[PDB]
Amino acid sequence: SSLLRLESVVMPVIFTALALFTRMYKIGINNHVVWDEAHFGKFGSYYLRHEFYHDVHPPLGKMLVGLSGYLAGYNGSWDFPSGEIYPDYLDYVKMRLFNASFSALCVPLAYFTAKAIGFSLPTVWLMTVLVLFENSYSTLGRFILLDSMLLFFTVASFFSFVMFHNQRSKPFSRKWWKWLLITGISLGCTISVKMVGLFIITMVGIYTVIDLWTFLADKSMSWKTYINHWLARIFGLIIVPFCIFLLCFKIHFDLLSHSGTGDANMPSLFQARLVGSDVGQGPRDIALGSSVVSIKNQALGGSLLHSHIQTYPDGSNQQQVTCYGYKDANNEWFFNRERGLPSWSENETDIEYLKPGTSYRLVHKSTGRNLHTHPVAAPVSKTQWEVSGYGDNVVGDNKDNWVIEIMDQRGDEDPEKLHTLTTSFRIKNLEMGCYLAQTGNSLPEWGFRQQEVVCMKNPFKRDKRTWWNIETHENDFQYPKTNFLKDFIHLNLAMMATNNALVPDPDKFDYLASSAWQWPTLNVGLRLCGWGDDNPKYFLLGTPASTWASSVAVLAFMATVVILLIRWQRQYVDLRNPSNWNVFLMGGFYPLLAWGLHYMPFVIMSRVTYVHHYLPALYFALIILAYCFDAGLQKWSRSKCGRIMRFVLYAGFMALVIGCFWYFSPISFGMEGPSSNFRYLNWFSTWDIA
Amino acid sequence: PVPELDIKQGPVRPFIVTDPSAELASLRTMVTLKEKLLVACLAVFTAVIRLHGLAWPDSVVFDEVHFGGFASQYIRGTYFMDVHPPLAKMLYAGVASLGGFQGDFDFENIGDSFPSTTPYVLMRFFSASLGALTVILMYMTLRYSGVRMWVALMSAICFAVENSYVTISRYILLDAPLMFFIAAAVYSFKKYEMYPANSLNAYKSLLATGIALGMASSSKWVGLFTVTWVGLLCIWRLWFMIGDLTKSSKSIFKVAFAKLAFLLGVPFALYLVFFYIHFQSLTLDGDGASFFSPEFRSTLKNNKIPQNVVADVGIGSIISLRHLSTMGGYLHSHSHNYPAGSEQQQSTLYPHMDANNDWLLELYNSLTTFQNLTDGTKVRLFHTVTRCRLHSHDHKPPVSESSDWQKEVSCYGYSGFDGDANDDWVVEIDKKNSAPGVAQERVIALDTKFRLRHAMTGCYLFSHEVKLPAWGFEQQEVTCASSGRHDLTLWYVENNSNPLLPEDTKRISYKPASFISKFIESHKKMWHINKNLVEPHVYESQPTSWPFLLRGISYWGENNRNVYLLGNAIVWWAVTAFIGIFGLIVITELFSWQLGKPILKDSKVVNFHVQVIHYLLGFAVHYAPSFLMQRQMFLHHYLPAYYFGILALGHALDIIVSYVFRSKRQMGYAVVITFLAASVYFFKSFSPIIYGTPWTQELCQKSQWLSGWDYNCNTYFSSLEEYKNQTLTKR
């Protein structure tokens, strides 16, 4: 009618207004860098200086922190330490205003989310005051984080997901393609802010597999229409979230182009392309005798060619030739002529350029041994021989002859000869015929814990372990542009490598870390800043009216799918009309599956997990609690005393999350006192809050 | 053999009843004389094949040193620690002592010949006897699963011929009693399938599933995966009992509660009883209980754990701290210097009692008083032998040197001449992990558990499970760490003595290990070794390399003979070929089902897909959690899952005979007789790799089909004649 349209207009701006109030009320009061504002603020400052970095998370969160800084009149010149005060030019009020505007847009998007998943009108209000009035969201929405952005594109992912579900009855319409492409864009932004956005794509992917499954059984659907469904779902649910992800790494690579911290996580050609370039040389590439080089492995894990002065305890008592991964004068190498010829002299006049396919003797500079494989096998891998260093310019054998073979050229110069950084080369022995390789495995402590170097007889030419490149040249030129897809793969493998390096040791007590069972039931919270009486002090935990009742609603619904499934097998006809099945499935079931996908990887994985990882998982738990208020009180809409009991039960629990948000309002709004004033909301132990 | 489906019309859709008649019980048991004659014939053939040439490898074989030596430990009574639950080692101790075995032979390393005092051929007879009975349990399991008589006979003869079970069951190993009790669990549960689930025969089958299932779970922890598999099949069967409408709800809860009671009560009861026989028979204390708590060791006989130490400790007492969490712990300092840091006197964890574990409690500031150790009383730990304090200068750690936390602690100082504030240690009693009473306030030996905070750096005294190889070998590291784990930070005092206390002092001793704490502590060491059992082994395999039978494990090499575990590859590759073909045909029956065509018309195809979802699910639950393990594992961990693979392959041969060749069963029996004939041919060619019987080298080269499996092929001679005129060495 008219009153429902009136609440439909004036009510989203009341919840939007209480979202802007709830998330922006004491933004500029703490006056110090906080929990991960020190990290993600710094990463946002890397874009404003256009300096390269490496970090675990995908860039669209950090690019939105850079866009959060460009709107603040800030040039990135201040790195973000932990704990320190702000300089007066860094207007952090616009940045915290920006992220708290993302959570303050996460609230009305939950309003229209709950409007889309059925939900008779008091349920939309309880779910909007439920996502709105919460100290976990308004605590972690207050700051320079990409948890507000992960939460925002998770809510836009579920919202555009149900708005895609609501036009399944008229497929291939304008609304169908609209919310399918908006679901693709929001899912792609959900990965590209943080890599745990694969969880919502597991949920929408399970919905898509269930749709294509039930579209196999429709008798009227032709095969042309069904193949149009497959191309529509792989396009708008696979290609578009991958095109947004690739576009985010295109703005990541093409935006920042200088050097910075964490530049060493790249292949040396991409590091040579960027502006800083402490790995490149202008005029000349390589020559014979005078070119002092350091050979680098292009394998993921290989390092510089090293030769320390200790000799082999297991071998032919020659000098150890291993691989080490830092700058050293023992990593210096050069080239000498083959066996039978007079060697290099320091008073030559012709600067000979090196020729591939020609045998040479690779001589270490600071020590003076010839690169050689000798008839003692490798110590760890007993399949192949062992690489050593023997003799000088005249003492040795015919096995000292090592050829140079071109494997790949990056153009912009002569491809016939060996070069620096533009010539990936394999090295093969002449008499034996083994290719110089590197397994990457670790040696025992006799070789000072360095890399194992093997010389395999027949590896393949598609092997990355045999590919070496020249990095240093020691006695007008631009390096070519690298392949963008290859840099995408190498940078995602470096991100996954830092994820594997993020696994904690069990001996160090990380005070801030938590386990996933503590995030519901609120066993522990999270201390975001310094707990002195000077600064206002924040604390991450949910409002215990929302997430206790919400967690017990996930337990009460996860044993409602089972009860309705047992009663389904017992031939009961549970959900009669398509309306209440629509509210069960979209309002109830896919939030149980999105809760499970957003939560159960955090209880399975071996990684440092904190309280702020439950914020996307808590949202679907709050949808589940909204459903347990929706369908659980649907039968009370028919009796008058049941109707009045229904509205005072909705108003009772809504007043409970109002009063329990306001009672715990100091732990998001500041706790400006001396931290002993706030022991009244220290309800349990392990809530280290006072 | 199998009846037609009895489907009935519910109020919405048709439902299938789950109450078999007594006819289904009579069709699938040994009701005739010909079937008992062929079970007796398969028992003769199996008892010849599984027990041929026994005690011909008359030396210890791979991991026969382990479970044989542990059987010797149960005979001698000296306590030991192994990864596994006790029943299939204590059971070899009962077979051994039943055969006249009195310890007396440490099973040291592979190749040690048995003396003529140890019964090994009787233990080998027990292991290969249970490995023979699992064949007859595969026949009866298969017939109870609903299977033609002759195809169960030829599939079970095909299982007696399987090389991997003859090797794994012939020797003193763990997978032969384990495989017997898993096979008896699926035996008794498939016997429970065919009974109407209310009668007394069905509850006898649940009780036999309980004692066999939990007697598998108590022999090796992969039996817990058979508990999981049986439980998922209980979700299957209770799901279809919900689907049955003629069954009342009280009947479904009676089958569910009695199913839960016989199938989780009786496994947990038998598991606890077998650990009670473990703790009750293994009473002596040896070097095996060297990494157990001193309250654990207080139950054991002939202890060196100190009893009746002085409870109330005072300032001026020669004491000895012991680390709580890491079992190898004492504060230990002796006259050897570090290789790094400041190269002062080292502070280590030495697990045994010395005089170098002794420390004085002296104040920062020896009177005639008894100033108690209150909470926050800063003291200086004065080592009484080498005349030094405990000093925590901020230098590099010895072996955990990559540590921004974990500050290094040492021992340096002169009594009366070099005493500074950096030798202080504030005693902070943890009031939670200490027992209540007087010990919660002040320091009582054995009863409180305090934490030594350094008074000038704010860091706590810390240790963990990393030793020191430089000097004082096999001794761990003492550090002074901030933000280290609160579990690894606790210290307590034992073996204290001061002159300023009378001889009528209230002593204290340990609370000696109530059976629940004994059980839980033993399982924390089970899980602790089992998770951290990382050794570089040359025959170690990878779980995705098991179903293709590449690179099997080796067992024994002596006197121009070898034993090597590679399975019957023409049964192995047909098992996993049937995992692939059954996955493909169940995908094409899902898509062909929903796409419009009707699937599952004939009842034999229905019981085929039902029992191969059952058996394939047994393959899934015994093989997929071996991917979820960060430890080493060999080819014989696939083998419980491979038992369900050969059951499902049994049903594959049944669907070749019984459905796809209904009109011409001579071709179905022709396919099964060529498969069985090729299987027995693979056994006959690979018999000299099982029994340690002689090959020739020109055929040993030809037998290596894949180059992946490699068993020292130059060990054999060039002809079989040279073995008769040959003497053999004995180690």
Ligand SMILES: CCCCC/C=C\C/C=C\CCCCCCCC(=O)O[C@H](COC(=O)CCCCCCCCCCCCCCC)COP(=O)([O-])OCC[N+](C)(C)C
């Ligand atoms: C996916 C892994 C799941 C693993 C766990 C599985 C189940 C445990 C979860 C919940 C168990 C509660 C089930 C109550 C169902 C009420 C349905 C109903 O109320 O209807 C009952 C049906 O009786 C049943 O079938 C109940 C079967 C119970 C199954 C076995 C229960 C497990 C035993 C306890 C195990 C531990 C449980 C707690 C675990 C946390 C009344 O039907 P009727 O015959 O009177 O009317 C005839 C129908 N006409 C009128 C249409 C014809």
Ligand SMILES: CCCCC/C=C\C/C=C\CCCCCCCC(=O)O[C@H](COC(=O)CCCCCCCCCCCCCCC)COP(=O)([O-])OCC[N+](C)(C)C
């Ligand atoms: C079939 C429906 C019945 C219901 C039961 C359900 C499933 C039963 C079926 C198979 C058992 C599932 C076990 C895998 C579960 C974990 C998945 C996993 O992870 O392993 C997968 C693959 O594993 C397998 O090779 C599956 C083997 C299944 C048996 C053989 C299948 C037939 C294939 C040969 C067909 C021959 C030709 C046919 C025509 C003649 C990869 O391993 P990964 O990723 O960990 O390697 C990473 C290791 N790093 C971390 C160290 C790098």
Ligand SMILES: C=C(C)CCCC(=C)CCCC(=C)CCCC(=C)CCCC(=C)CCCC(=C)CCCC(=C)CCC[C@@H](C)CCOP(=O)(O)O
């Ligand atoms: C409830 C109903 C409705 C019906 C009742 C149905 C029912 C009977 C049960 C309800 C259905 C149900 C879901 C049960 C859950 C199963 C249950 C009780 C418990 C979970 C069991 C588990 C799967 C896991 C936890 C245990 C572990 C400690 C597993 C670690 C494993 C190992 C590391 C083994 C190592 C041994 C070997 C591999 C290596 C050494 O090998 P070597 O010899 O040295 O080389």
Ligand SMILES: *[C@@H]1O[C@H](CO)[C@@H](O)[C@H](O)[C@H]1NC(C)=O
């Ligand atoms: C960045 O802003 C600060 C703040 O005034 C200023 O001092 C500095 O010069 C600026 N740097 C650049 C490169 O603009």
Ligand SMILES: *[C@@H]1O[C@H](CO)[C@@H](O)[C@H](O)[C@H]1NC(C)=O
């Ligand atoms: C030290 O404190 C304990 C705590 O009750 C007390 O029993 C003991 O008598 C005290 N020591 C002396 C010498 O009073």
